[PDB]
Amino acid sequence: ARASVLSGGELDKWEKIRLRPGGKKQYKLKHIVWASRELERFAVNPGLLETSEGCRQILGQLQPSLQTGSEELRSLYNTIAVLYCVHQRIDVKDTKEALDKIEEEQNKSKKKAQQAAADTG
Amino acid sequence: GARASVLSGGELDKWEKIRLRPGGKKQYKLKHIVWASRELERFAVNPGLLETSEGCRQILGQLQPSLQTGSEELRSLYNTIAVLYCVHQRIDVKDTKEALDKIEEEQNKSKKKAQQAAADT
Numbered sequence: 623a624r625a626s627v628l629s630g631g632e633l634d635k636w637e638k639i640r641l642r643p644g645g646k647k648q649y650k651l652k653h654i655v656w657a658s659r660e661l662e663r664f665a666v667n668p669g670l671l672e673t674s675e676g677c678r679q680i681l682g683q684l685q686p687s688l689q690t691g692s693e694e695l696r697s698l699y700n701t702i703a704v705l706y707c708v709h710q711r712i713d714v715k716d717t718k719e720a721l722d723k724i725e726e727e728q729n730k731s732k733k734k735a736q737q738a739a740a741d742t743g
Numbered sequence: 744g745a746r747a748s749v750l751s752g753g754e755l756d757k758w759e760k761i762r763l764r765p766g767g768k769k770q771y772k773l774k775h776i777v778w779a780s781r782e783l784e785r786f787a788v789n790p791g792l793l794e795t796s797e798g799c800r801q802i803l804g805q806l807q808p809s810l811q812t813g814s815e816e817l818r819s820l821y822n823t824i825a826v827l828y829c830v831h832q833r834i835d836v837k838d839t840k841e842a843l844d845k846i847e848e849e850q851n852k853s854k855k856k857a858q859q860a861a862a863d864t
């Protein structure tokens with residue numbers, strides 16, 4: 623699960639992203655292996671880490687449990703959030719920025735969906 | 744019509760400076776409150792809920808699922824009540840677009856303070 627999930631280029635940008643905004647630990651291979659084993663624990667298909675859409679669907683499954691979520695649950699969500707941004711080639715420098723951008727991309731997409739339907743005709 | 748129970752004095756003078764469209768010339772008037780009031784009755788929604796920040800919030804939650812497929816009338820009604828909410832909340836807006844952006848920004852920050860409140864146990 624250390625070569626199927628990310629490409630070579632994806633990995634090099636993965637290993638520069640910091641776990642927390644003002645911290646110097648960064649993401650490693652071990653966080654990919656861990657998230658993989660975690661999803662199986664949660665009865666989720668780990669193969670979905672391999673793509674943007676797969677990651678999106680995982681975050682959709684996990685979102686409802688996020689506010690009451692344990693630290694393990696929150697760490698798993700944040701990791702997959704960073705993976706999604708990587709797959710999308712959205713630049714991020716830490717976990718918080720990936721969450722902000724995913725939030726920003728959900729608003730943009732819902733906006734364009736409303737404009738597209740509204741201007742239909 | 745009168746329907747002068749919805750906005751106070753300070754609120755009415757802010758209402759009438761807000762533009763219907765972000766860079767437009769027409770601004771909200773008393774006839775837009777009268778109209779929104781009658782529109783809600785026709786949608787079988789309590790128009791007295793226009794009189795408070797909490798009332799407008801509950802209306803927006805009622806109408807939101809219908810928004811993407813809504814007609815111009817439905818969208819106009821939603822937009823009008825989004826501005827009223829911002830007026831009641833003393834959120835400074837200058838047009839309908841900004842009112843919608845700030846409601847979304849407010850929902851984002853409440854959901855994350857709630858996630859941080861629980862996350863700190």
Ligand SMILES: O=P(O)(O)O[C@H]1[C@@H](OP(=O)(O)O)[C@@H](OP(=O)(O)O)[C@@H](OP(=O)(O)O)[C@@H](OP(=O)(O)O)[C@H]1OP(=O)(O)O
Nearest residue numbers: 634635636637638639640645646647648649713714715716
């Ligand atoms: O390959 P390097 O010369 O070692 O520089 C890279 C990198 O810069 P690049 O993206 O151009 O490779 C980092 O930060 P960003 O530029 O992505 O913002 C980071 O910079 P910091 O000094 O701020 O940490 C750090 O430079 P350095 O190795 O001197 O500490 C990093 O190496 P790391 O990714 O392992 O931190």
Ligand SMILES: O=P(O)(O)O[C@H]1[C@@H](OP(=O)(O)O)[C@@H](OP(=O)(O)O)[C@@H](OP(=O)(O)O)[C@@H](OP(=O)(O)O)[C@H]1OP(=O)(O)O
Nearest residue numbers: 756757758759760761762766767768769770771836837838
């Ligand atoms: O006669 P006024 O009521 O004083 O209208 C003027 C003004 O127009 P003038 O520059 O010609 O005086 C502005 O609008 P524009 O003509 O440039 O479009 C301004 O507009 P904003 O609301 O965007 O700030 C505002 O209009 P409003 O009536 O909404 O307050 C403002 O005068 P006030 O300082 O009296 O508001």
